[PDB]
C-alpha cells in the first residue's frame, strides 16, 4: 500500500487524497496508519530457534 | 495580391551535393571473463584497429561489459540504435557484422515493395481524360 501511496502523491499533487479520513481496510480491519495489537505488541509465538 | 506561406521548408536529399554516413557511433563491448567473448577480444586487437582507421567518420568506443555477452551497438543520425550480439563468433565474423552496421541505416527493416522512391513530380504529369484525344464508346 505504501508503494501505491507514494506514487499517487507524486502524480496528483494538489489533489492528494485524505486517506486518514477513509474507511477501514476490510482485509485486516485496521485504520489508516494504524497497526494491529498483535503486531504492535509482538504477541506472536515464535519458533524455539 | 500574393501572400506568402511561411510553413513550408526545404527537405534534404542525402547524397545529392554531399554525402553523410548514417552510422555516427559504434559501441564495442567485451568481457575479459565470459568465454563467449573470446572472439570479440581478438576482433578488438586484430581487425578493429584497421577497420576504425578506415572509417574516420564513425566514433568507436571500446568499453568492458563483464557478465554480459559481447555486442556491437551502432548509433545512427536518425536517432535509432542497432545492437548485434556477437557471442561465440570469430573475429572475421565480427568484422562482417561491423560492416553491416556501417552500411546500414537506423530505419526499421521493411519488405521489398518498390525499387524507386521519388518526391519530385512526374515529368509527363499524371494521366487525365480531359487532356487527350477523347474516347468514343
Amino acid at each position: 500500500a505504501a508503494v501505491e501511496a507514494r506514487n499517487e502523491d507524486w502524480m496528483l499533487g494538489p489533489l492528494a487524497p485524505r486517506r486518514e479520513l477513509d474507511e477501514i481496510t476490510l482485509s485486516n480491519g485496521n485504520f489508516f496508519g494504524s497497526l494491529s495489537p498483535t503486531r504492535a505488541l509482538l504477541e506472536s509465538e515464535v519458533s524455539e530457534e | 495580391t500574393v501572400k506568402a506561406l511561411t510553413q513550408i521548408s526545404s527537405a534534404g536529399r542525402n547524397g545529392v551535393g554531399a554525402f553523410v554516413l548514417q552510422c555516427k557511433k559504434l559501441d564495442i563491448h567485451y568481457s575479459d571473463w565470459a568465454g563467449s567473448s573470446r572472439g570479440m577480444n581478438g576482433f578488438i586487437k586484430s581487425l578493429l584497429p584497421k577497420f576504425a582507421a578506415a572509417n574516420p567518420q564513425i566514433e568507436f568506443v571500446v568499453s568492458p561489459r563483464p557478465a554480459k555477452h559481447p555486442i556491437l551497438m551502432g548509433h545512427y543520425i536518425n536517432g535509432r540504435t542497432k545492437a548485434i550480439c556477437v557471442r561465440n563468433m570469430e573475429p572475421l565474423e565480427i568484422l562482417k557484422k561491423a560492416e553491416l552496421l556501417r552500411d546500414a541505416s537506423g530505419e526499421k527493416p521493411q519488405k521489398f515493395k518498390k525499387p524507386v522512391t521519388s518526391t519530385n513530380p512526374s515529368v509527363r504529369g499524371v494521366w487525365s481524360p480531359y487532356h487527350g484525344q477523347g474516347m468514343a464508346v
Binding site: 487524497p17 485524505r18 486517506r19 | 525499387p115 524507386v116 499524371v126 494521366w127
Partner: protein
C-alpha cells in the same frame, strides 16, 4: 487536474450475467440519476448497488474532494447570467452542465468473486451435480463533469482537424512500374 475515485464494492450474492445489466444501466449517468434508477428498479441487487453507490459518493467527497463547488457554481452562472456549457457524450447524448463538479459514473465493470457455497443437485438415475452459488463485485469510477467537458472538447477538435470533404480527392496510385502507361 481531474479528480477520480475507484471504488470496489463488497461481494454481492449474485452472478456476473445478472449484475452486468445493472452496471451497464448506471454507466455514464450522474450519481443522483443512478441512485434514482436503483431505488425504483425491480432487481434485488439494485438495493445493494444503491447502498454501495452512496458509500462511494461519501469517499469521493471526503477523501478526494469531489462535488464541493455547487454553491460557488450557482453564483457564477445565475448571478452573472452567463450560459452554461453544452457538451455531447461519446454515445451522443446531449447535456447542459451547470456545475462542473457534479459527480458521475465514468466507468463501471463487474468482477467474479469467491464461491458463496455449493449446492448438490440430485437428479434421476442416481446422478448428482454440484451447483455453485456465486458472488460478484462491482467497480465504479466516479469523476466530475470537468472530465466530460474536456473529452468533448477533444472529440470536437479531432473532427475539425480531419479537414473538409473535397469533391476531387487526390487518391494515390499504388502500383509502380518501370515505364509510362500514358
Amino acid at each position: 487536474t481531474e479528480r477520480k475515485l475507484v471504488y470496489k464494492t463488497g461481494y454481492l450474492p449474485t452472478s456476473v450475467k445478472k449484475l452486468v445489466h445493472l452496471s451497464r444501466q448506471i454507466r455514464g449517468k450522474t450519481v443522483s440519476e443512478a441512485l434514482v434508477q436503483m431505488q425504483f428498479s425491480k432487481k434485488k441487487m439494485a438495493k445493494e448497488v444503491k447502498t454501495e453507490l452512496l458509500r462511494a459518493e461519501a469517499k469521493a467527497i471526503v477523501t478526494r474532494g469531489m462535488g464541493l463547488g455547487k454553491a460557488a457554481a450557482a453564483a457564477a452562472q445565475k448571478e452573472t447570467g452567463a450560459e452554461p456549457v453544452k457538451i455531447q457524450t461519446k454515445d451522443g447524448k446531449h447535456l447542459e452542465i451547470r456545475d462542473p463538479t457534479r459527480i458521475y459514473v465514468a466507468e463501471t465493470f463487474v468482477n467474479k468473486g469467491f464461491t458463496r457455497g455449493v449446492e448438490l443437485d440430485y437428479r434421476a438415475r442416481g446422478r448428482v451435480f454440484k451447483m455453485n452459488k456465486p458472488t460478484t463485485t462491482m467497480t465504479v469510477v466516479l469523476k466530475e463533469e470537468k472530465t466530460r467537458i474536456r473529452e468533448h472538447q477533444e472529440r470536437v477538435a479531432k473532427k475539425l482537424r480531419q479537414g473538409p470533404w473535397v469533391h476531387l480527392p487526390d487518391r494515390p496510385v499504388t502500383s509502380q512500374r518501370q515505364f509510362y502507361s500514358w
